[PDB]
Amino acid sequence: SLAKLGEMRTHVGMVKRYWNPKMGFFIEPERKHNNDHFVLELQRQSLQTAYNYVKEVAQNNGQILFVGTKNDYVKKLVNNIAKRVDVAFITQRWLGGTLTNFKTLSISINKLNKLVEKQAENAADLTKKENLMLSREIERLEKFFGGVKSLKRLPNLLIVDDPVYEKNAVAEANILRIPVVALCNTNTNPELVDFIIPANNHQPQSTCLLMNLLADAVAEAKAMPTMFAYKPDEEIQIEI
Amino acid sequence: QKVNSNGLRFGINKNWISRWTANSHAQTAKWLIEDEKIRNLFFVNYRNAQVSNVEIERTQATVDVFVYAAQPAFLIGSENKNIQKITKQIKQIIGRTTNLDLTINEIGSPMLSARIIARDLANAIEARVPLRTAMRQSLIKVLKAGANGIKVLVSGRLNGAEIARDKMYIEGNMPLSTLRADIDYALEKAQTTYGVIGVKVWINRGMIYTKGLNR
Amino acid sequence: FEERIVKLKRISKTTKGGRNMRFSVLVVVGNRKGKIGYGIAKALEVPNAIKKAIKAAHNSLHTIEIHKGSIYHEVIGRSGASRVLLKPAPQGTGIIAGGAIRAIIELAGYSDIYTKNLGRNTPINMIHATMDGILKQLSPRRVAILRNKNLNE
RNA sequence: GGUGCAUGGUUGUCGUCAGCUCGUGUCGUGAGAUGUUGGGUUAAGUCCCGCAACGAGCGCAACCCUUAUCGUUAGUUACA
RNA sequence: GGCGAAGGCGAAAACUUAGGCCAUUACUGACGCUUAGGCUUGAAAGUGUGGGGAGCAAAUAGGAUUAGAUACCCUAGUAGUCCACACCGUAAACGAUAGAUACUAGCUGUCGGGGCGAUCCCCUCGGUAGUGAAGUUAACACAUUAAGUAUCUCGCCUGG
RNA sequence: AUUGGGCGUAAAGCAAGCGCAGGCGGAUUGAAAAGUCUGGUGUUAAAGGCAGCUGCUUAACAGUUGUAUGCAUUGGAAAC
16 A cells, blocks of 8 residues: 555544644644544545655655654654665754755764774774763764764755754755655644644654654655555554 | 963974074173174065075074075076075175075975065055955965964054054964964064054964974 | 945944944845845955855845836835835836935836835835835736636736 | 154953854844853863754963983993 | 722621623614713822821921931821811823724633533633734734724824 | 824823714615716816927027816716
């Protein structure tokens, strides 16, 4: 299949009493108790639209920057995506200053490359504090710039666990003219995505199946095998 | 308030522009008064060659002069006339019987000495070149030679009585406190029809390290 | 692109001893085919600020269509309690304004305008309101497609 | 001989401080902010972490001498 | 928290009664709307009129202190604060946001009313609040109770 | 500031409530058509002006033509 409705089984409900009303236009008529439940058919339609749209964008020799910044679950599974499909991954969101100022990513990636070279070229003269400085510089420039740590190419598309979760992601997204697609919740402002994906992320199955479907969409545009919507089994893994 | 660690840099981290040993404490004053005239005359008389520095040694009324320049071709000149003029001038300025031997050597990135930099910057300022463009010319002069970061200041008068309007350039790693830094600082007092103007340049010969002793 | 300066003024802040003597500049760029934009810059010298504001303006190009040699429709551009009137002035008078407004209109691709200012004489909100009014003009085909009736209106 | 508000150079006050400046760009409708800030952590913007931020530079430490144990070097007019 | 037209309403107890909140194709069938003029009310000082005056402080007066205290300290201390009457009818009576009218994301609170039901939760509508969307003030910010949206009427408004 | 502006802090909502002069009004329908359009005529002057021409050397100037311009008197319409 392709973006099967079988995955659309637990994409309902989040933290209540906090929700953007304009999501009720895009999700469903939500009760006074802030019922964060999502519809199935409209969510599936929008998810399939995003799927094949990012597929056709990545078939144009583009890039889908996979961003993972939630507690541990989204980040770990985005790293699994990166090790499954050749796409960039986020351990920690870049603090801003990547796209509109291209020099600021180039300096970081070059610094990390030279840091790796220095770590692999000399370790006898270094002291414990000097080695800690070197490792901390590596860690800093890897987390101060997650999507740009060894590559200089400008991403042609980026996702995020929540388009209101990351200010820098939105800034470097709206800097470019790209179809930004993101996992959107009820507490999220819908005005920061191209195709809204109204679905849950507090439920771990929901978000992991969603971003795995995104991984399959980018992989089928990269001519490599795809697993979800092609295997009927839904993943069961609690949100680490 | 405004000091550069160059006296300690020159002498225990580098050499002097005029170094010589002696056993008496009386002829030192005479030698130091005598050699400065030769140094100043050689600097002012030869700016087409951009004479970077002159080393003077003085022992028992025995004066020897060495010259390092950014453009030593003008020191020799066409058909080797300027070299003869320089040799006779230096031989006569040190004494009728004072010995003299000279060799011509060059330095990497020849326009790295702040002396000629400040002199040429003042010349550009007073040579139909606006102050901003003269600043840029001095910056290129230090930069196109192959030198490191640049500090350029021009203080004094704008033909007025105001002290709250000027421009100044800082570009790169210039530690005012690092002893082992190889920094050259020079000043020129230029006479304009409204006063004297100080043109100061701090130029890095290169961010030197592991070389902190005299050579 | 002409990259012409339109406004310079010295802006200063209070810091630990002394004030921030420095004059800022602001350039309007255009191509007279419709593209126009503006950009501000700060520097301590004339040419550096000129070039920085030139590049900042040239980073912003907003195209606008031609009607009667002027803007598409009458609009009173408002910004910061400042209003500047822009109209589809018929070509019977020419560009009648000061040098700044004449240049702003010319880099907008328009030949003439009837100017009208509302509010304070401070210039930065004059520029903001003028730019807002100029850029917010309408188009026939766009409003046709947006509306239920879509041929040209 | 003054005109140091004509100045060059010169040092000192705060204070050798605990911070400072600058670019990229972002956020403001402009003054401006950002980073450069803040939690841990220092004499220090010392670094980490987080944050439209990213870094470049300056001040304290940094080479320098000065300082101490040992090993060692040449050998008197030393030591012995 | 509610109400009262603002002025305001708190030891309790009763009465007259303005007015209120909830839902009524329910009835006249526009009877409407405001408001220059016009009607009434209007904190309070302080005025005199009759009592008591518990207490105190304008004023006044001593000791300080001060460059000097009838300023900040206090003691003595009247008008007055108290009440009955008028008049004073001004207030930071300003939300420096008019009255009548209808509409504009939400969200989290409260009170009152209607339904319901261990309580309750809940829904309805108002009142009473806010962050904030949109919208609107240069800006500060308001924002379903607007400074948002719009109709009728009036008052205020052009340099110190 | 109808054209062509405000009333929270850079004029500011009347001190509060009620009201007329005066002002405007919810829906349907009919009379009437003042408001409304419409059909016209009279006159609103030649000189003046808009468009046009002539001559004064050329307009300055002078002359000149279609045209202005506001009332009354006239067939209707029902949308309020």
